[PDB]
Design a binder for this molecule. Structure first.
Ligand SMILES: Nc1nc2c(ncn2[C@@H]2O[C@H](COP(=O)(O)OP(=O)(O)O)[C@@H](O)[C@H]2O)c(=O)[nH]1
Ligand SMILES: [Mg+2]
Lengths: 136, 151, 151, 50
């Protein structure tokens, strides 16, 4: 019915956005109404970790601890809503913005825009303080 | 010799109406220094690289507009304007991420070099990525990176 | 802020509050905040402490709750409780409640629209300057030519 | 000489020697509207040429 583990929904194939058809078919088999929660923010800010907490799990969306970017594209986890019977909670984990090894800088805008369009709740993840750059 | 320390108003104040004054303070810090300390938190962000790129180009353009009327401009020939930009010191505060890239441990200096390294080639796929880095490579040949733990 | 303690929500609202006045010195400041006020009427802010000792951040998901900061464990629970209690079912125009198939349709519609060029790109601030100034340079050169030929 | 540099560059900034780039929505409008004129002209040229 639901997913035991998250899957990649949208891949960065070369430098073009491509949808994973397996994840789409599992998502379209989902018959219940969906509450869709997406996270977005700079890379290396603990987004993936926080999304696993919304799934109520210690592991799920992959977490790494190097200076390099980890999460790529957009990953989807369709889980039961923990309080509403007959509703589905969808978690969308995103590639982090501002990757200094990423050539396709415009893909950051594309992932952000998709996260806004596909969600009902948008989690903007920043570090330390409210920055003017983050507002802009 | 006299050591001269310049402490600056921080960029990105969300209560500051004059957002263009941030570029002015940044440009003045580049123009007046011999060593430029760029202070960042946790990691090297693309926004920090692009801001340094943008301000450096604006700073070179302002300096060019105050050279042909300046008698202090006339005292040299062959040295480009880039040769008088300050040395670059990149500080990483509250540093906690593993200094490892592609399975290899790296120094903070190698981490800075990897972040600012232009991708090889000449294609359209690389032009946007290499544009700030070609500038930073040109105007800041001498770089140094330092990490600082959470204190 | 200004000698008064504020909540995280009051801190977020203060940062995003538009300045009163309507004058030119406030236009740039008010531009992002008028948009954010319009597109996101319902806002919430959450603070999270540093989650553990800095040497144990790399293994954070493997640690038990007593090795983390206690305030962080509580703050994560409060965040998760708020998301579960206040998040709505996704809607579309015409009173339509989004389910799996409709969400799949939205993914395909927007991915295809991005791949066909419907989404604008945010350019580098230097290339943007060159585009403006060089276009103005062509117009000045043409105006000079027209003046010289017309005389 | 450093005093001279401070006065020289502060005056140059104060007189407009530092370029100023405008915001987001106006910059987007400038790009998209210029492209819109070109698309409209291309459509006109196609219709008249046929
Ligand atoms: N400083 C800090 N580090 C965290 C926090 N949460 C997770 N981390 C660590 O930060 C690193 C990157 O986390 P990750 O989930 O991959 O960040 P993401 O790239 O935004 O998804 C991991 O090693 C985590 O253990 C936090 O709240 N603060
Ligand atoms: Mg991650």
């Amino acid at each position: 019915i639901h997913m035991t583990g998250p899957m990649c929904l949208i891949e960065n194939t070369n430098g073009r956005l491509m949808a994973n058809p397996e994840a789409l078919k599992i998502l379209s088999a989902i018959t219940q109404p969906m509450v869709v929660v997406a996270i977005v923010g700079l890379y290396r800010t603990g987004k993936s970790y926080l999304m696993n907490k919304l799934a109520g799990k210690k592991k799920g969306f992959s977490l790494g601890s190097t200076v390099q970017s980890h999460t790529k594209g957009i990953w989807m986890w369709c889980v039961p809503h923990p309080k509403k019977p007959g509703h589905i909670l969808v978690l969308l984990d995103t590639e982090g913005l501002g990757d200094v090894e990423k050539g396709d800088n415009q893909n950051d805008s594309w992932i952000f825009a998709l996260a806004v369009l596909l969600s009902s709740t948008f989690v903007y993840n920043s570090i330390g303080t409210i920055n003017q750059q983050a507002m802009d | 010799h006299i050591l001269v320390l310049l402490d600056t108003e921080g960029l990105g104040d969300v209560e500051k109406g004059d957002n263009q004054n941030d570029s002015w303070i940044f440009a003045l810090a580049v123009l007046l220094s011999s060593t430029f300390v760029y202070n960042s938190i946790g990691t090297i962000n693309q926004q920090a690289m692009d801001q340094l790129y943008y301000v450096t180009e604006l700073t070179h353009r302002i300096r060019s507009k105050s050279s042909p009327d300046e008698n202090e401009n006339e005292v040299e020939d062959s040295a480009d304007f880039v040769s008088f930009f300050p040395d670059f010191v990149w500080t990483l505060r509250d540093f906690s991420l593993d200094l490892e890239a592609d399975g290899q441990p790296l120094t903070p200096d190698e981490y800075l070099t990897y972040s600012l390294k232009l991708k090889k080639g000449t294609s359209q796929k690389d032009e946007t990525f290499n544009l700030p880095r070609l500038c930073i490579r040109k105007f800041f040949p001498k770089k140094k990176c330092f990490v600082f733990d959470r204190p | 802020a200004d000698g008064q303690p504020l909540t995280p929500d009051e801190y977020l609202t203060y940062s995003l509050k538009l300045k009163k006045g309507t004058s030119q010195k406030d236009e740039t400041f008010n531009l992002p905040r008028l948009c954010i006020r319009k597109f996101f009427p319902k806002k919430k802010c959450f603070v999270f402490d540093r989650p553990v000792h800095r040497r144990k951040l790399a293994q954070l998901e493997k640690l038990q709750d007593e090795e983390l900061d206690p305030e962080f464990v509580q703050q994560v629970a409060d965040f998760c409780s708020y998301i579960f209690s206040n998040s709505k079912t996704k809607t579309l125009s015409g009173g339509i409640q989004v389910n799996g198939p409709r969400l799949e349709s939205l993914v395909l519609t927007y991915v295809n629209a991005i791949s066909s060029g419907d989404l604008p790109c945010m350019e580098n601030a230097v290339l943007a300057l060159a585009q403006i100034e060089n276009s103005a340079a062509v117009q000045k050169a043409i105006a000079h030519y027209e003046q010289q030929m017309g005389q």
